[PDB]
Amino acid sequence: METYDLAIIGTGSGNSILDERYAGKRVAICEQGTFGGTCLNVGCIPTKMFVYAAEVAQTVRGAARYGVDAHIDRVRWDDIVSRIFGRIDPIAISGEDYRRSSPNIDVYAQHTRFGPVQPDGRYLLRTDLGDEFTAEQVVIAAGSRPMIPPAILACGVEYHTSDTIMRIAELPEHLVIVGGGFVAAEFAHIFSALGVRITLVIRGGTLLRHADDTICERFTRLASTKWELRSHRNVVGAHHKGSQIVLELDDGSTVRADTVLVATGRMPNGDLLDAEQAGIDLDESRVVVDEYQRTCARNVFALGDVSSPYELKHVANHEARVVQHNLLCDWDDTESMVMTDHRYVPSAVFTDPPVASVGMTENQAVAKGFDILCAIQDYGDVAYGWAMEDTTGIVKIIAERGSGRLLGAHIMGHQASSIIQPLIQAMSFGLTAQQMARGQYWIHPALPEVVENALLNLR
Amino acid sequence: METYDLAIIGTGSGNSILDERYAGKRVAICEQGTFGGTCLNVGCIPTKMFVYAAEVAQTVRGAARYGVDAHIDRVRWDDIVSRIFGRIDPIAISGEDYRRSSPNIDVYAQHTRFGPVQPDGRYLLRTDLGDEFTAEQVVIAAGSRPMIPPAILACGVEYHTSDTIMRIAELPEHLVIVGGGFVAAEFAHIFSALGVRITLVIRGGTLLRHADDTICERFTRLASTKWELRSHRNVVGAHHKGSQIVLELDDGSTVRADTVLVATGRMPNGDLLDAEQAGIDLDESRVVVDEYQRTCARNVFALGDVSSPYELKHVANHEARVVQHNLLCDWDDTESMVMTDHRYVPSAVFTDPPVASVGMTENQAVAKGFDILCAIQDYGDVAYGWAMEDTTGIVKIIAERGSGRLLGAHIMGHQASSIIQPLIQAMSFGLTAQQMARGQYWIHPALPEVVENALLNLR
Numbered sequence: 067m068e069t070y071d072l073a074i075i076g077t078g079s080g081n082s083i084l085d086e087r088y089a090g091k092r093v094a095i096c097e098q099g100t101f102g103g104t105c106l107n108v109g110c111i112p113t114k115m116f117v118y119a120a121e122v123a124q125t126v127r128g129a130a131r132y133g134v135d136a137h138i139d140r141v142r143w144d145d146i147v148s149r150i151f152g153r154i155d156p157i158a159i160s161g162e163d164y165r166r167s168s169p170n171i172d173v174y175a176q177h178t179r180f181g182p183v184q185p186d187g188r189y190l191l192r193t194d195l196g197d198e199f200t201a202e203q204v205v206i207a208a209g210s211r212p213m214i215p216p217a218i219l220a221c222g223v224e225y226h227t228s229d230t231i232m233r234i235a236e237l238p239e240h241l242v243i244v245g246g247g248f249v250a251a252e253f254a255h256i257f258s259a260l261g262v263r264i265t266l267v268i269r270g271g272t273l274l275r276h277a278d279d280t281i282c283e284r285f286t287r288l289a290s291t292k293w294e295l296r297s298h299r300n301v302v303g304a305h306h307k308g309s310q311i312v313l314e315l316d317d318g319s320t321v322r323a324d325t326v327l328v329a330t331g332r333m334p335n336g337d338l339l340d341a342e343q344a345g346i347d348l349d350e351s352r353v354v355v356d357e358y359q360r361t362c363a364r365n366v367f368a369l370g371d372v373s374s375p376y377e378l379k380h381v382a383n384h385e386a387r388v389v390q391h392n393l394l395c396d397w398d399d400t401e402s403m404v405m406t407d408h409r410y411v412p413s414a415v416f417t418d419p420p421v422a423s424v425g426m427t428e429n430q431a432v433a434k435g436f437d438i439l440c441a442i443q444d445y446g447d448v449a450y451g452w453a454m455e456d457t458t459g460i461v462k463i464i465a466e467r468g469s470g471r472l473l474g475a476h477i478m479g480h481q482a483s484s485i486i487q488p489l490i491q492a493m494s495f496g497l498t499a500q501q502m503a504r505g506q507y508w509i510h511p512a513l514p515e516v517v518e519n520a521l522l523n524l525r
Numbered sequence: 526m527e528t529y530d531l532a533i534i535g536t537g538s539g540n541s542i543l544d545e546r547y548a549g550k551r552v553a554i555c556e557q558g559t560f561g562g563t564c565l566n567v568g569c570i571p572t573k574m575f576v577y578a579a580e581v582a583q584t585v586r587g588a589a590r591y592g593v594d595a596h597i598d599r600v601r602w603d604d605i606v607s608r609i610f611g612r613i614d615p616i617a618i619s620g621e622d623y624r625r626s627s628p629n630i631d632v633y634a635q636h637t638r639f640g641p642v643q644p645d646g647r648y649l650l651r652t653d654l655g656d657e658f659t660a661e662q663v664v665i666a667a668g669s670r671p672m673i674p675p676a677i678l679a680c681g682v683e684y685h686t687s688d689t690i691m692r693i694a695e696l697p698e699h700l701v702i703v704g705g706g707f708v709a710a711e712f713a714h715i716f717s718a719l720g721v722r723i724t725l726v727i728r729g730g731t732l733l734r735h736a737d738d739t740i741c742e743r744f745t746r747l748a749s750t751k752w753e754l755r756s757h758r759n760v761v762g763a764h765h766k767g768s769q770i771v772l773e774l775d776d777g778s779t780v781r782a783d784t785v786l787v788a789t790g791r792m793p794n795g796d797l798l799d800a801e802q803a804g805i806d807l808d809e810s811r812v813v814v815d816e817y818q819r820t821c822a823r824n825v826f827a828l829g830d831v832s833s834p835y836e837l838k839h840v841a842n843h844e845a846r847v848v849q850h851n852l853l854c855d856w857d858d859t860e861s862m863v864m865t866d867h868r869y870v871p872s873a874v875f876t877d878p879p880v881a882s883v884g885m886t887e888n889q890a891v892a893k894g895f896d897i898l899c900a901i902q903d904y905g906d907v908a909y910g911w912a913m914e915d916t917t918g919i920v921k922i923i924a925e926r927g928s929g930r931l932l933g934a935h936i937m938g939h940q941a942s943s944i945i946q947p948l949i950q951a952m953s954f955g956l957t958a959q960q961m962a963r964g965q966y967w968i969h970p971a972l973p974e975v976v977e978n979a980l981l982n983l984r
């Protein structure tokens with residue numbers, strides 16, 4: 067049997083643990099699917115590349131408003147797919163070849179599960195091919211997998227998820243999306259901008275439900291006029307028809323289209339590990355960790371989607387950095403170990419219009435007993451908004467009345483994930499709304515003026 | 526004769542002086558040209574509206590690179606001008622009616638000059654129509670006007686400036702621009718993106734002379750391959766040809782095109798006032814002011830292009846705010862007066878590629894005896910750059926080696942005037958490079974990641 071000092075399950079953020087302080091340790095790396103994890107191959111990187119091409123075509127479509135007459139000749143979808151994954155696919159292969167060609171690193175390209183704990187305290191791990199080995203320390207970075215409602219699985223009908231939809235053979239003409247979360251908004255924007263008709267089936271009444279009240283309402287109303295919304299509807303049946311899909315809904319409604327995309331959330335992969343037998347406490351399928359990314363089993367760490375309350379790459383990378391440090395400390399010397407920082411986690415939805423958020427919503431601050439100052443700033447009230455002829459963009463800021471402390475910011479409009487970064491910075495370092503507005507210059511007539519004027523109109 | 530407590534020359538930033546603390550004072554407002562100043566009518570606001578429409582045509586032109594085949598049918602220049610100035614002209618009119626319709630405000634639509642000082646210390650002012658009045662306090666906000674080299678004036682040939690080119694009858698096919706400043710770059714981007722051929726005549730070797738060495742160099746080579754660059758050449762003669770222009774150069778070379786634009790700097794309008802006669806010291810044509818926006822004459826303030834070392838609207842507005850406060854104190858009570866803050870002044874050039882900067886250049890920091898860390902970060906080395914297929918965008922950051930203090934930042938690339946705002950904030954509030962890089966989250970995979978990785982690569 068092979069002996070290892072460390073074992074890492076998952077090559078997403080889990081691939082970022084190894085640094086100079088680990089050379090000289092024999093480590094085992096386990097990857098079920100493609101090397102590099104979800105973000106690089108079927109997540110953040112390819113999706114946003116698809117979003118950019120979509121927004122380029124959206125620009126051509128609405129060019130007449132600015133006095134430029136244009137039209138779209140052809141959408142070379144095969145060339146779009148090939149250009150994107152033509153740069154991604156070699157990276158996963160070369161990145162796998164970098165670990166394989168290391169003398170101290172052994173790569174196991176199989177699904178790995180926890181075996182029984184050995185007498186000496188080490189952990190046994192076995193793959194689906196029956197290859198076993200031991201390791202003194204283990205990191206669980208197994209990520210998550212898409213959740214599919216039971217009725218679609220029971221009907222055995224062919225479907226798409228985020229993991230398959232980006233490599234469809236050719237662009238469909240009508241696409242149903244079940245669900246209305248981050249994945250649904252982005253992929254509805256991508257395909258509709260490329261000409262596809264879109265139908266959304268959501269069990270609720272609104273899109274991006276957990277966003278701020280103002281954003282959720284306004285975003286849903288805008289979406290309703292460009293995509294077909296079937297509110298308050300679950301799928302209870304589905305079947306094929308030639309090359310089309312039919313969706314039977316809970317009220318007897320039907321939805322017929324060429325393909326279906328299921329965007330109904332994801333599920334942590336902590337249940338596919340035999341974790342609880344080895345002392346790794348599970349909350350349903352989520353690995354439980356403390357403030358140090360430590361599980362309940364000794365010398366076992368977890369990070370990322372498999373354990374974090376956030377399904378975000380910039381959180382998973384920070385959690386891996388915590389694990390990278392805490393693996394080189396004694397398991398019980400907690401005060402030489404570093405804690406995870408979830409204090410001001412931001413997020414963005416690369417849909418149309420783009421959305422970005424950090425901190426508390428308005429309702430969250432009132433429900434926590436805050437005396438709030440609030441402002442909603444239209445893009446159209448600022449010079450850069452004039453050049454855009456913008457009528458829907460907004461930035462909403464919530465602040466405490468006493469100190470001027472920044473409590474939340476939520477943007478729906480052009481460059482949302484960009485112009486929110488100063489608000490992220492101010493919150494993370496205790497900058498007040500007064501200081502941020504007038505203790506620094508804002509370039510005229512650049513877009514950040516919309517944030518500046520939002521701070522000045524806090525009432 | 527009419528008596529006034531305050532007199533304001535210029536309705537640009539000078540129109541933003543009047544505030545609640547001024548109701549109850551008889552005010553005289555003098556505007557030679559159009560109400561609102563240069564920025565609103567012939568500057569920042571109208572120009573950037575043209576930059577956005579140009580970038581839409583840019584998007585259509587290079588759309589096949591992203592897999593969308595499109596093309597431009599026609600450029601409705603008449604509709605562009607009408608849409609832009611269709612919103613601007615009513616704003617200048619309505620804003621003029623707001624001051625006119627005030628009982629305490631009297632508007633004089635003529636060129637106003639300083640008369641001899643009256644015995645009581647009051648100031649006499651006369652218009653071009655010969656109407657006189659007195660005022661106890663005066664602000665000079667006369668701005669600036671373009672400088673034209675002698676040979677173009679001597680040749681009596683028709684020319685354009687920033688004040689006229691934006692309302693031209695029809696788009697030329699070829700346009701000469703003399704000079705290589707902010708106005709030259711922006712207007713070169715505007716018209717070339719709309720199909721016009723561009724020729725630049727500059728007496729130097731570079732196009733963005735006062736920018737950072739790296740930015741100035743790289744921007745020039747990019748310009749040389751898309752616009753025709755006439756290095757180290759002055760214009761010594763010019764004459765007509767049908768409806769075309771011919772430009773004779775100092776080495777006997779010629780440049781033939783449809784129209785000419787002079788972007789050869791601006792000159793403060795302090796010489797059109799008889800200022801020195803009333804004790805207003807002038808530096809050539811610039812009114813001199815101290816750290817309190819006070820001139821050398823008693824009860825006379827200055828702000829904007831007429832006195833500031835910066836021709837920037839966000840500086841002109843802050844100086845007007847300084848004047849707004851200091852006007853309500855005794856002329857000698859300097860310790861109750863506020864000082865203007867010219868620290869960390871930012872600027873941006875809305876060209877292609879866009880440029881934005883704040884703080885010192887690399888050369889400036891070494892000349893100040895700084896042990897510097899430096900980094901140049903490619904957009905293409907960051908996930909958002911992949912979605913752009915970006916090969917030219919860069920971010921340059923200079924920091925002190927000891928403390929990590931941020932000394933300067935310079936961006937050439939997409940959304941430059943946006944993604945620089947966090948660096949402005951950090952410098953204005955003493956955030957170090959270490960805290961800024963890892964004391965806060967950055968949204969993955971948003972454009973600000975290019976700034977984050979620049980801080981991490983300070984070497």
Ligand SMILES: Cc1cc2nc3c(=O)[nH]c(=O)nc-3n(C[C@H](O)[C@H](O)[C@H](O)COP(=O)(O)OP(=O)(O)OC[C@H]3O[C@@H](n4cnc5c(N)ncnc54)[C@H](O)[C@@H]3O)c2cc1C
Nearest residue numbers: 076078079098103104109178208209228370371377378379
């Ligand atoms: C469509 C989509 C778009 C997204 N867009 C964004 C975005 O714009 N911004 C953002 O911040 N986040 C985004 N996310 C979220 C982000 O991708 C995740 O938070 C991130 O991938 C989590 O990283 P991880 O390493 O924890 O998981 P993963 O990257 O999924 O790593 C888990 C890896 O381990 C493998 N594995 C699992 N179990 C085993 C096992 N037992 N044995 C061996 N190997 C195993 C898996 O196959 C996988 O390769 C997106 C997610 C999706 C699905």
Ligand SMILES: Cc1cc2nc3c(=O)[nH]c(=O)nc-3n(C[C@H](O)[C@H](O)[C@H](O)COP(=O)(O)OP(=O)(O)OC[C@H]3O[C@@H](n4cnc5c(N)ncnc54)[C@H](O)[C@@H]3O)c2cc1C
Nearest residue numbers: 535537538557558562563569637667668829830836837838
């Ligand atoms: C083409 C161009 C583009 C620019 N783009 C930007 C940009 O993107 N961002 C930015 O921050 N800055 C920009 N600027 C600079 C900005 O426009 C100026 O810094 C700003 O206008 C300064 O305001 P002001 O009130 O000092 O001058 P002005 O706005 O020019 O105010 C002076 C006014 O007073 C009048 N006046 C002058 N002398 C007299 C007199 N003797 N009697 C009576 N009336 C008089 C003038 O007619 C004018 O209306 C740009 C400038 C130009 C030329």
Ligand SMILES: NC(=O)c1ccc[n+]([C@@H]2O[C@H](COP(=O)([O-])OP(=O)(O)OC[C@H]3O[C@@H](n4cnc5c(N)ncnc54)[C@H](OP(=O)(O)O)[C@@H]3O)[C@@H](O)[C@H]2O)c1
Nearest residue numbers: 215245246247248249250269270275329330331332377414
């Ligand atoms: N740019 C980004 O940051 C980005 C992009 C993509 C994904 N992500 C992350 O990836 C994760 C997954 O995204 P997601 O959009 O799939 O999930 P999500 O954001 O959690 O939204 C899930 C959606 O699916 C619906 N749904 C769930 N179960 C359902 C069922 N059984 N029947 C019908 N509808 C059902 C939900 O309805 P209810 O709300 O009523 O339950 C909701 O509309 C999230 O954590 C998200 O933040 C991030």
Ligand SMILES: NC(=O)c1ccc[n+]([C@@H]2O[C@H](COP(=O)([O-])OP(=O)(O)OC[C@H]3O[C@@H](n4cnc5c(N)ncnc54)[C@H](OP(=O)(O)O)[C@@H]3O)[C@@H](O)[C@H]2O)c1
Nearest residue numbers: 674704705706707708709729734788789790791836873874
């Ligand atoms: N977005 C913005 O912030 C923005 C936009 C437009 C303008 N502005 C400001 O407005 C002001 C005016 O802009 P500008 O472009 O007119 O001036 P500028 O930016 O100061 O540049 C002036 C240019 O004219 C050239 N020049 C001067 N005298 C010349 C001569 N006799 N013959 C030939 N070339 C000559 C200069 O060459 P040398 O360098 O060798 O002197 C330089 O290239 C500046 O202060 C600028 O910052 C700001």
